[PDB]
Design an enzyme around this catalytic site. Structure first.
Site, short mmCIF file in Angstrom:
data_model
loop_
_atom_site.label_atom_id
_atom_site.label_comp_id
_atom_site.label_asym_id
_atom_site.label_seq_id
_atom_site.Cartn_x
_atom_site.Cartn_y
_atom_site.Cartn_z
N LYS A 46 9.83 7.52 -7.66
CA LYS A 46 11.27 7.47 -7.85
C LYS A 46 11.63 7.78 -9.31
CE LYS A 46 11.56 3.22 -6.25
NZ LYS A 46 10.12 3.02 -5.94
N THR A 47 10.95 7.11 -10.24
CA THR A 47 11.19 7.32 -11.67
C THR A 47 10.85 8.75 -12.04
OG1 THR A 47 10.67 4.99 -12.20
CG2 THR A 47 10.58 6.57 -14.00
N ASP A 91 16.90 1.80 -12.99
CA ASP A 91 15.82 1.31 -12.16
C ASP A 91 16.21 -0.10 -11.72
OD1 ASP A 91 13.36 1.33 -10.88
OD2 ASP A 91 12.29 0.52 -12.62
N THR A 128 13.67 -0.69 -4.56
CA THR A 128 12.55 -0.77 -3.63
C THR A 128 13.05 -0.63 -2.19
OG1 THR A 128 12.73 -3.20 -3.78
CG2 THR A 128 10.99 -2.14 -5.07
N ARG A 187 0.82 6.40 -7.35
CA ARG A 187 0.41 5.73 -8.58
C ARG A 187 -0.98 5.12 -8.43
NH1 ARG A 187 4.36 1.18 -10.36
NH2 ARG A 187 5.47 2.95 -11.33
N1 LIG Z 1 1.70 16.77 -9.48
C1 LIG Z 1 1.79 15.45 -9.55
N2 LIG Z 1 1.06 14.76 -10.47
C2 LIG Z 1 1.16 13.42 -10.51
N3 LIG Z 1 1.91 12.62 -9.73
C3 LIG Z 1 2.64 13.36 -8.81
C4 LIG Z 1 2.63 14.73 -8.65
N4 LIG Z 1 3.48 15.14 -7.63
C5 LIG Z 1 3.96 14.01 -7.20
N5 LIG Z 1 3.51 12.89 -7.84
C6 LIG Z 1 3.87 11.48 -7.57
O1 LIG Z 1 4.53 10.91 -8.70
C7 LIG Z 1 4.14 9.51 -8.85
C8 LIG Z 1 3.65 9.38 -10.26
O2 LIG Z 1 3.26 8.02 -10.51
P1 LIG Z 1 4.14 7.03 -11.36
O3 LIG Z 1 3.35 5.82 -11.67
O4 LIG Z 1 4.73 7.80 -12.46
O5 LIG Z 1 5.34 6.73 -10.38
P2 LIG Z 1 6.82 6.33 -10.61
O6 LIG Z 1 7.71 7.51 -10.63
O7 LIG Z 1 6.83 5.42 -11.80
O8 LIG Z 1 7.08 5.41 -9.29
P3 LIG Z 1 8.36 4.55 -8.82
O9 LIG Z 1 9.47 4.72 -9.87
O10 LIG Z 1 8.67 5.03 -7.47
O11 LIG Z 1 7.88 3.18 -8.83
C9 LIG Z 1 3.08 9.23 -7.79
O12 LIG Z 1 3.73 8.50 -6.72
C10 LIG Z 1 2.65 10.60 -7.40
O13 LIG Z 1 2.18 10.71 -6.07
#
Ligand SMILES: Nc1ncnc2c1ncn2[C@@H]1O[C@H](COP(=O)(O)OP(=O)(O)OP(=O)(O)O)[C@@H](O)[C@H]1O
Ligand SMILES: [Co+2]
Length: 299
Positions: A46-47, A91, A128, A187
């Protein structure tokens, strides 16, 4: 390790196509993108998507969270710092208190606040669970994107991408093993890949194989179903203390010594999805799969 564009984002096909349509159109017309709500368990991107939205629009992103904005003054300072087309990323948006919440709602109806005109911007909220937002606020988002758990195949692609960036080789079989133990979460897959990389370093191997992954999982205490220490503690607590359930969320949370949210918003989602847990009106219950997996005699 985060992607910078939608084209670089692996998985979440349903979300990408919906977002891409609105994003590309808004850019072509040079219009401010309609407000977007991102909902789904933690670690799904999401972030990451919020940042991609600002980058694709070529605008500035302002990151914050409900728990942080306690007084209207805090919300006011942010809204006034927004430039036309900027992205306001909130967030845990459902955690906004009445005060700041009312102020934000007002700024998104005519872009103006009183204890001050606001520059047209795009509100990107993350939670969430979309249902956690009040009826009024949620009705303001013209674009609601519900993220789901990634498939094993998508996770493997993410794991291979991560390894490539970490200057490490990995065999498909090994990547597949990590994906199967990533609890449908990107993640988690990336972090497990970093840990497996550490094992490769200590054992002095040329590439990540199934042996190396297995050794890492043993050290991290992650089982064949990707369950960790706390996942098993949740299931064992229901099994032993509550006789398999049903047990209420508040009661289970108190017994575990954690906040109810940590269970229902962070851990339970995958447990439910994977069929280890189920929800009933009387509370949570463990399934036969949970008893079998944890080696508890099926009562
Ligand atoms: N090419 C990529 N490389 C890395 N992560 C990727 C890629 N494409 C998609 N993603 C997704 O982006 C997320 C990166 O992990 P991160 O810990 O930054 O999540 P986030 O955006 O903080 O999660 P949330 O805000 O939903 O809790 C993972 O869920 C991953 O599957
Ligand atoms: Co309850």
């Amino acid at each position: 390790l985060r992607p910078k564009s939608l084209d670089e984002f692996i998985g979440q096909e349903n979300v990408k196509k919906k977002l891409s349509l609105a994003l590309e159109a808004a850019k072509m017309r040079g219009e401010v993108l309609d407000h977007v709500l991102l909902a789904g368990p933690p670690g799904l991107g999401k972030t990451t998507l919020a940042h991609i939205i600002a980058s694709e629009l070529q605008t500035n992103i302002h990151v914050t969270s409900g728990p942080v904005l306690v007084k209207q003054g805090d919300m006011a300072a942010i809204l006034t710092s927004l430039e036309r087309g900027d992205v306001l990323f909130i967030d845990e948006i459902h955690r906004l208190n009445k005060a700041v919440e009312e102020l934000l709602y007002s700024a998104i109806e005519d872009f103006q606040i009183d204890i001050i005109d606001i520059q047209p911007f795009t509100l990107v909220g993350a939670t969430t669970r979309s249902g956690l937002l009040s009826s009024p606020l949620r009705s303001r988002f013209g674009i609601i994107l519900e993220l789901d758990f990634y498939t094993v195949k998508e996770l493997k692609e993410i794991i291979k991408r991560a390894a490539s960036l970490m200057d490490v080789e990995i065999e498909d079989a090994a990547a597949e093993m990590i994906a199967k133990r990533s609890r449908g979460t990107g993640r988690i897959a990336i972090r497990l890949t970093k840990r497996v990389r550490d094992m490769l370093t200590v054992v002095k191997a040329d590439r990540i194989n199934t042996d190396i992954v297995l050794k890492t999982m043993e050290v991290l205490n992650i089982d064949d179903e990707g369950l960790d220490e706390f996942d098993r503690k949740i299931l064992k607590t229901i099994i032993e203390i509550y006789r398999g359930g049903p047990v209420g969320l508040n009661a289970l949370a108190a017994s575990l010594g954690v906040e109810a949210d940590t269970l229902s918003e962070v851990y339970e989602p995958y447990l439910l999805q994977a069929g280890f847990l189920a929800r009933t009106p009387r509370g949570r219950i463990v399934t036969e799969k949970a008893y079998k997996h944890l080696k508890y005699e099926v009562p």
